[PDB]
Design a protein around this ligand. Structure first.
Ligand SMILES: [Zn+2]
Length: 44
């Protein structure tokens, strides 16, 4: 198998919270605030 997070597809938009690349900004922007809400990842 493989290891590490590496691939082919870099976007001009990156999340300053989870470091997740996106296609459009609109999505990213909302993806930033949305982080807090949808019961999922443990804030910590
Ligand atoms: Zn994010």
């Amino acid at each position: 198998g493989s290891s590490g997070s590496s691939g082919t597809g870099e976007k001009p938009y990156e999340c300053n919270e989870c470091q997740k690349a996106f296609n459009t900004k609109s999505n990213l922007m909302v993806h930033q605030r949305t982080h807090t809400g949808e019961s999922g990842p443990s804030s910590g």
